[PDB]
Design an enzyme around this catalytic site. Structure first.
Site, mmCIF file in Angstrom:
data_model
loop_
_atom_site.group_PDB
_atom_site.id
_atom_site.type_symbol
_atom_site.label_atom_id
_atom_site.label_comp_id
_atom_site.label_asym_id
_atom_site.label_seq_id
_atom_site.Cartn_x
_atom_site.Cartn_y
_atom_site.Cartn_z
ATOM 1 N N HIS A 257 -25.256 -77.750 -28.037
ATOM 2 C CA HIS A 257 -26.055 -76.978 -28.515
ATOM 3 C C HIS A 257 -27.661 -76.969 -27.994
ATOM 4 C CE1 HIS A 257 -23.983 -75.039 -32.223
ATOM 5 N NE2 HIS A 257 -23.188 -75.675 -31.259
ATOM 6 N N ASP A 258 -27.799 -78.261 -27.659
ATOM 7 C CA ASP A 258 -29.173 -78.400 -26.797
ATOM 8 C C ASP A 258 -28.939 -77.808 -25.386
ATOM 9 O OD1 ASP A 258 -31.690 -79.398 -26.260
ATOM 10 O OD2 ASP A 258 -31.064 -81.320 -25.338
ATOM 11 N N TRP B 191 -11.869 -77.015 -20.618
ATOM 12 C CA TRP B 191 -11.919 -78.395 -20.552
ATOM 13 C C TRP B 191 -13.174 -79.008 -21.586
ATOM 14 C CZ3 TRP B 191 -12.741 -77.750 -14.652
ATOM 15 C CH2 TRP B 191 -11.252 -77.311 -14.083
ATOM 16 N N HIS C 132 -13.145 -80.378 -29.272
ATOM 17 C CA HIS C 132 -12.601 -79.975 -30.626
ATOM 18 C C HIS C 132 -11.534 -80.796 -31.198
ATOM 19 C CE1 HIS C 132 -14.771 -75.798 -31.023
ATOM 20 N NE2 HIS C 132 -15.800 -76.788 -30.789
ATOM 21 N N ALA D 118 -14.860 -81.358 -36.576
ATOM 22 C CA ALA D 118 -14.692 -80.651 -37.908
ATOM 23 C C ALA D 118 -15.716 -79.581 -38.197
ATOM 24 C CB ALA D 118 -14.584 -81.727 -39.008
ATOM 25 N N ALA D 119 -15.394 -78.815 -39.288
ATOM 26 C CA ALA D 119 -16.195 -77.803 -39.781
ATOM 27 C C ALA D 119 -16.931 -78.103 -40.856
ATOM 28 C CB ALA D 119 -15.712 -76.457 -39.605
ATOM 29 N N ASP D 120 -18.216 -77.871 -41.003
ATOM 30 C CA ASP D 120 -18.930 -77.671 -42.566
ATOM 31 C C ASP D 120 -19.357 -76.708 -42.935
ATOM 32 O OD1 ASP D 120 -18.541 -80.726 -42.360
ATOM 33 O OD2 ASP D 120 -20.730 -81.011 -41.987
ATOM 34 N N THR E 282 -5.864 -85.095 -35.925
ATOM 35 C CA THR E 282 -6.249 -86.192 -35.238
ATOM 36 C C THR E 282 -8.180 -86.528 -34.963
ATOM 37 O OG1 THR E 282 -5.586 -85.814 -33.213
ATOM 38 C CG2 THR E 282 -4.041 -87.036 -34.761
ATOM 39 N N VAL F 59 -9.069 -89.088 -32.867
ATOM 40 C CA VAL F 59 -8.449 -89.710 -31.766
ATOM 41 C C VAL F 59 -8.747 -88.504 -30.623
ATOM 42 C CG1 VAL F 59 -6.436 -90.454 -30.474
ATOM 43 C CG2 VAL F 59 -6.731 -90.952 -32.964
HETATM 44 C C1 HEM Z 1 -16.962 -72.474 -26.318
HETATM 45 C C2 HEM Z 1 -17.668 -71.897 -27.588
HETATM 46 C C3 HEM Z 1 -17.573 -72.867 -28.669
HETATM 47 C C4 HEM Z 1 -17.716 -72.242 -29.973
HETATM 48 C C5 HEM Z 1 -17.556 -70.769 -30.420
HETATM 49 C C6 HEM Z 1 -18.051 -73.381 -31.004
HETATM 50 C C7 HEM Z 1 -17.962 -73.206 -32.247
HETATM 51 C C8 HEM Z 1 -18.146 -74.425 -32.983
HETATM 52 C C9 HEM Z 1 -18.159 -74.201 -34.539
HETATM 53 C C10 HEM Z 1 -18.250 -72.836 -35.512
HETATM 54 C C11 HEM Z 1 -17.920 -75.524 -35.039
HETATM 55 C C12 HEM Z 1 -18.057 -75.862 -36.497
HETATM 56 C C13 HEM Z 1 -19.963 -75.987 -37.182
HETATM 57 C C14 HEM Z 1 -19.520 -76.334 -38.649
HETATM 58 O O1 HEM Z 1 -19.404 -75.262 -39.264
HETATM 59 O O2 HEM Z 1 -19.979 -77.442 -39.008
HETATM 60 C C15 HEM Z 1 -18.225 -76.405 -34.061
HETATM 61 C C16 HEM Z 1 -17.938 -77.926 -34.199
HETATM 62 C C17 HEM Z 1 -17.925 -78.687 -33.137
HETATM 63 N N1 HEM Z 1 -18.327 -78.500 -31.891
HETATM 64 FE FE1 HEM Z 1 -17.791 -76.540 -30.905
HETATM 65 N N2 HEM Z 1 -17.829 -74.664 -30.214
HETATM 66 C C18 HEM Z 1 -17.998 -74.496 -28.697
HETATM 67 C C19 HEM Z 1 -17.990 -75.048 -27.912
HETATM 68 C C20 HEM Z 1 -18.162 -76.426 -28.170
HETATM 69 C C21 HEM Z 1 -18.598 -77.407 -26.766
HETATM 70 C C22 HEM Z 1 -18.635 -77.082 -25.381
HETATM 71 C C23 HEM Z 1 -18.535 -78.458 -27.317
HETATM 72 C C24 HEM Z 1 -18.864 -79.982 -26.547
HETATM 73 C C25 HEM Z 1 -19.658 -80.934 -26.782
HETATM 74 C C26 HEM Z 1 -18.525 -78.499 -28.918
HETATM 75 C C27 HEM Z 1 -18.326 -79.608 -29.665
HETATM 76 C C28 HEM Z 1 -18.154 -79.514 -30.886
HETATM 77 C C29 HEM Z 1 -17.914 -80.599 -31.891
HETATM 78 C C30 HEM Z 1 -17.890 -82.143 -31.684
HETATM 79 C C31 HEM Z 1 -18.012 -80.245 -33.203
HETATM 80 C C32 HEM Z 1 -17.684 -80.919 -34.666
HETATM 81 C C33 HEM Z 1 -18.994 -80.994 -35.466
HETATM 82 C C34 HEM Z 1 -18.726 -81.940 -36.747
HETATM 83 O O3 HEM Z 1 -17.644 -82.573 -36.676
HETATM 84 O O4 HEM Z 1 -19.302 -81.814 -37.584
HETATM 85 N N3 HEM Z 1 -18.267 -77.221 -29.268
HETATM 86 N N4 HEM Z 1 -17.948 -75.777 -32.851
HETATM 87 CA CA LIG Z 2 -7.791 -85.170 -31.981
HETATM 88 CA CA LIG Z 3 -32.355 -77.205 -24.924
#
Ligand code: HEM
Ligand SMILES: [Ca+2]
Ligand SMILES: [Ca+2]
Length: 329
Positions: free
Chosen positions: A47-48, A164, A169, A173-175, A189, A192
């Site tokens: 997001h940054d 990639w 993901h 998780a989603a909150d 997992t 993991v």
């Molecule tokens: C490509 C389009 C992407 C979309 C539409 C997307 C969407 C989302 C959404 C909706 C969540 C849940 C947020 C919540 O409700 O708590 C999430 C979580 C997350 N996203 Fe993605 N994301 C994208 C790409 C990425 C990328 C490129 C990364 C690379 C770091 C990433 C890393 C994460 C991680 C680690 C979580 C877990 C947050 C948690 O466990 O609280 N996402 N993402």
């Molecule tokens: Ca996993």
């Molecule tokens: Ca930024």
């Protein structure tokens, strides 16, 4: 070079990172675990960084989501990140690096805590943010596939690069997507870093794990697992389906491509030749645990084949009745 306590690194500017490493491992990541703080910190890196466009503006991986938190954490697409921004802010305040470097460093150290993880290259020297990111530069899970790909493309990523980066993901998780079930992971997992995300998103949907009318969510194959609409469609779209499938049971590719593409993401708005290589600071991740499988009670006929060039690989299922996936504590 040799740092204050005798730990070594190739470029001595990087010695600043050893006490930061120790502090976040103990006081941010709950003693170097792959849990909710690591997951949120990884999300923060994206997001940054993604607040960058050669025409729409934004400084990219510049720490702006922290420096201008009162602006950026109010963008609808940033729902839920305020917590990790608050948690990281005092580390940036206490320590001797820019908010841009800190975000990417914390995400890389975080990933290295997860079994199966990879060492993401890390460069030091990002200047402070100049201005808040424009809004509407972060992809949303209800955006059209072509929109998500075009947005990521504008920032510099090919469609396969987006696949990639979504290996993240696998530890996630989603909150806010379904607030009735916060902490519900995108794969079975979340502790993991592995291919189960790419496998489980390819299964036929079965049920909503919480409420049924949440924007950006579609049916999940498993109780206790949530499926984003964007991931559902990326797993099935002609631009990305075969690459998505290619990740299944391919740990080395997931590791290698995530690392190289995260390094590229971490440098959005920046020039690698104006930074210092500090990659040797990142710890060695633990070995992968578990093996690529279909969830208990599923078979290959539950997979929705979407890759036109190659069939989905057969995978053994876990033995037993179907099961619920526990939320991320
Ligand atoms: C490509 C389009 C992407 C979309 C539409 C997307 C969407 C989302 C959404 C909706 C969540 C849940 C947020 C919540 O409700 O708590 C999430 C979580 C997350 N996203 Fe993605 N994301 C994208 C790409 C990425 C990328 C490129 C990364 C690379 C770091 C990433 C890393 C994460 C991680 C680690 C979580 C877990 C947050 C948690 O466990 O609280 N996402 N993402
Ligand atoms: Ca996993
Ligand atoms: Ca930024």
């Amino acid at each position: 070079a040799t740092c204050a306590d005798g730990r070594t690194t190739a470029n001595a500017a990087c010695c600043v990172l050893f006490p930061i490493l120790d502090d976040i491992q103990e006081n941010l990541f709950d003693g170097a675990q792959c849990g909710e703080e690591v997951h949120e910190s990884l999300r923060l890196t994206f997001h940054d960084a993604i607040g960058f466009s050669p025409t729409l503006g934004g400084g990219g991986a510049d720490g702006s989501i922290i420096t201008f938190d009162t602006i950026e954490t109010n963008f609808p697409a940033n729902a839920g990140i305020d917590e990790i921004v608050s948690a990281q802010k005092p580390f940036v305040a206490k320590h001797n690096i820019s908010a841009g470097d800190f975000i990417q460093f914390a995400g890389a150290v975080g990933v290295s805590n997860c079994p199966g993880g990879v060492r993401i290259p890390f460069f030091l020297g990002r200047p402070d943010a100049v201005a808040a990111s424009p809004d509407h530069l972060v992809p949303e899970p209800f955006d059209s596939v072509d929109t998500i790909l075009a947005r990521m493309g504008d920032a510099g990523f090919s469609a396969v690069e987006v696949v990639w980066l979504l290996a993240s993901h696998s530890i996630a998780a989603a909150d806010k997507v379904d607030p009735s079930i916060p902490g519900t992971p995108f794969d079975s997992t979340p502790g993991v870093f592995d291919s189960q995300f790419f496998i489980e998103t390819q299964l036929k949907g079965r049920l909503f794990p919480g409420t049924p009318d949440n924007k950006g969510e579609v049916q999940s194959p498993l109780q206790g697992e949530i499926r984003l609409q964007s991931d559902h469609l990326l797993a099935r779209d002609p631009q990305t389906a075969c690459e998505w499938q290619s990740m299944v049971n391919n740990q080395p590719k997931i590791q290698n491509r995530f690392a190289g593409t995260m390094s590229k993401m971490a440098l959005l708005g920046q020039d690698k030749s104006k930074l210092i290589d500090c990659s040797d600071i990142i710890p060695t991740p633990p070995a992968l645990v578990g093996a690529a499988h279909l969830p208990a009670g599923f078979s290959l006929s539950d997979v929705e084949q979407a890759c036109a060039e190659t069939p989905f690989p057969a995978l053994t299922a876990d033995p037993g009745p179907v099961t619920s996936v526990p939320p991320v504590p």
